[PDB]
Amino acid sequence: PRYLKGWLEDVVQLSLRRPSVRASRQRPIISLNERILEFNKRNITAIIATYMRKSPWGLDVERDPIEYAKFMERYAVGLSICTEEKYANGSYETLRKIASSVSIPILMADFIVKESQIDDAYNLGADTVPLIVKILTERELESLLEYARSYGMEPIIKINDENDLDIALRIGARFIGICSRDWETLEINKENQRKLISMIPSNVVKVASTGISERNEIEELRKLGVNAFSIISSLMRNPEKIKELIEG
Ligand SMILES: *C(C)CC(=O)c1ccc2cc(OC)ccc2c1
Helix, strand or coil: CCCCCHHHHHHHHHHCCCCCCCCCCCCCCHHHHHHHHHHCCCCCCEEEEECEECCCCCEECCCCHHHHHHHHHHCCCCEEEECCCCCCCCCCCHHHHHHHHHCCCEEEECCCHHHHHHHHHHHHHHCECCCCCCCCCHHHHHHHHHHHHCCCCEEEECCCCHHHHHHHCCCCCEEECCEECCCCCCEEHHHHHHHHHHHHHCEEEEEEEEECCCCHHHHHHHHHCCEEEEHHHHHHHHHHHHHHCCCC
């Protein structure tokens, strides 16, 4: 990975040491980006709901993962299940149970820094993983991206600024998540997010991280070309909120 500091450096070092799993996947890969584009053609707002027990920005919710997932299965274009242990209290078992309980696309949300974590996501039933430009060297990004695609996954490439975007396009990203929060400082900058979004080619499937506000953000960003929206805290706190966000 890249040289980092603070909690980010810690979690990356932890992740390099993540014991890999053995398991045989049950179902073929269900494409998250393809389902996003199908929602777009059907005029259905595409929201990625996230299961995440804890976050370095203080989120702290205990709730049943399966009931959360089965509820979301009816509304979300996909699910993002955080499997990072130390800062998010996630686990691989949580992913495996959710993956076998629902039939919508699943993103394994974690710090992917080695090939065996992609093995893990595939074996556990995830359909895709994120690859974060801020933590991986360009050589790592390109190679992990090839590796995941060899399984039939299309990873989402996470970007925070223009340089991240330049790298993502250079390495052949077709599925991009524009973060509003900086991974290192956890600062949110929506202006820079909107700015980044206007720089992305039309043929890239674009997911914007959304949270504070929502609804108003969804309408405005959707006009800027955004294809789907990933949301964490507000949905962990009030799952039924997704319905109003999609409808009235
Ligand atoms: C973009 C949608 C990538 C993504 O979904 C995501 C969300 C949250 C998250 C939290 C982490 O902290 C443990 C790691 C990765 C990750 C990826």
